[model samples]
Target: MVKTLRLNNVTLEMAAYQEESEPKRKIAFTLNVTSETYHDIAVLLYEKTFNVEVPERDLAFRGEMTNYSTSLTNLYEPGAVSEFYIEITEIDKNADSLEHHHHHH
Candidate 1:
């Protein structure tokens, strides 16, 4: 019955990496979530032009959807905002018209 999803203020956390092979700067990461349209959802993450990893499942939704959580991290540019893409699809309902794509900052 949830209509919309939002990142709660407390779940947001920060971290930093200091190494010769990576950028040495303070970085912050947060567990963010978005609204659910249907089931068989998949989350994805990207930095600049390359994809980093498959987005993490947002658990705050209480399994309303298959997955509803995501974290943005592991970037060459710390504190640099990266683009994210979310695609939601329905496998149990339909096949041809059972998908939704959402893009966010």
Candidate 2:
């Protein structure tokens, strides 16, 4: 499924989830957003302050932006680095707690 989310003037296009070898699944997406908004998205992601809505199902889920990157020269190219690839993973809040207990003892 392809969905769109916007933050200010920047917009991101989210695609279907990817095959996962690990417990956490991956959600891949793309964007052509401004540099300032790029940082804003990063902040929201780090703070786990964003929600992904699936309008078709009328559902929303908490997710963490797991990874993002672009070519080094892309930043230096003409206008702001608008093209970016982003990856998100569903927030398994309980998973961390489980691992924590195993490590602490």
Candidate 3:
């Protein structure tokens, strides 16, 4: 999934991306943090939320970071390409409407 992920407005080199309702729609993907992207992505991940887009599926949503497990590799080295596993949970109007009086299952 080379150019399948767009976070904020920059296209990312992603892999193994998947989506699920997860009750509120969540997408999980691998963020390839490389030397050319490490600094830029470093600041991007610092933000609390992002505008996530999947051009292949023609989908867009307002989401926040959920899971960020980057232990597989490090990005500081010049040739490093850390595959950071990340998840984004959609924060939409209907999700809140349904959340008003439901029990967590």
Candidate 4:
């Protein structure tokens, strides 16, 4: 199994990129997702080395799912530290319009 990091608002402090990756401004963010009915834990992850940017509109994923995985693949390289905040919501709903336009794979 791959070693995974679960980032939550109460635990997330800050993240920094190497000096070599500066000017591009590498930063880590915190996402806070509240549960609706079920108390399920979901993870949000970006592709390896990809630069991630948080969505402008709020995002919500399903709650009953056991291992729900969604990713942003086009913003940057594969898994590189990025500017986006990975979030998992406990509410299941359709993707927003903006999300519909950009989601890949």
Task: Identify the leading candidate in terms of lDDT.
Answer: 3
* lDDT (C-alpha, whole model) for all candidates: 0.26, 0.43, 0.57, 0.28
Record all residue pairs in model 1 with backbone atoms less than 3 Å apart, i.e. clashing. Answer: 57-69, 58-68, 58-69
From the highest TM-score down, the ranking of the candidates is 3, 2, 4, 1
Off by over 4 Å in 3: 1-3, 35-46, 66-80, 92-105
Q: What's the number of clashes in each of the models? A: 3, 0, 0, 12
TM-score of candidate 1 versus the correct structure, residues matched by position: 0.19
Candidate 2 collision pairs:
none
Q: Candidate 2's residue-wise lDDT over 10-62, tens digit each? A: 33443323424377655444434566545555443333223556556454665
My TM-score estimates for the predictions, one after another, are 0.19, 0.43, 0.55, 0.20
Question: Would you list the rank order by lDDT, best first?
Answer: 3, 2, 4, 1
| Best model per TM-score | 3
lDDT of 1 by residue, 34-99 (tens): 324112222233222222121253233211122332433222211323322222212133234644
Q: What is the alpha-carbon RMSD of candidate 1 to the true structure? A: 16.9
> Which ranges in model 1 have alpha carbons more than 4 Å from their true place?
1-23, 37-41, 49-105
> Candidate 2: what lDDT?
0.43
- Give me candidate 4's TM-score against the actual structure: 0.20
